[PDB]
DNA sequence: CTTTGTGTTTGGTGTGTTTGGGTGGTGGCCGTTTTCGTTGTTTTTTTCTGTCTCGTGCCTGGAATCC
């Protein structure tokens, strides 16, 4: 579980469809409304 | 067939008169109503008792989203 969070976040820090970080946020933070 | 005009008859009421009686102004007898003295009273004025009110010691007083 630690190692696959690292994994995933990892890459977030090197980062008219949202993508990236924001998306990353909405997905994480399960969003009733999506931009 | 049957309505009104009255023919005739009878009851209600407008006047007049005599009579009489239910009842109207005075009188004088009596216990009623009224006024004075007595008793309770209550509430308004005066009074007896503690918050306000103004001077001290000290020592605290001051940029979106989701739930």
């Given at each position: 579980?630690?190692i696959a969070?690292?994994?995933?976040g990892e890459?977030?820090t090197?980062?008219?469809?949202?993508?990236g970080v924001?998306?990353?946020k909405?997905?994480?933070?399960?969003a009733?409304?999506?931009?």
């Open positions: 579980g630690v969070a690292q994994s995933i890459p977030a090197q980062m008219n469809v949202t993508l924001p998306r990353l909405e997905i994480l933070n399960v009733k409304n999506i931009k």
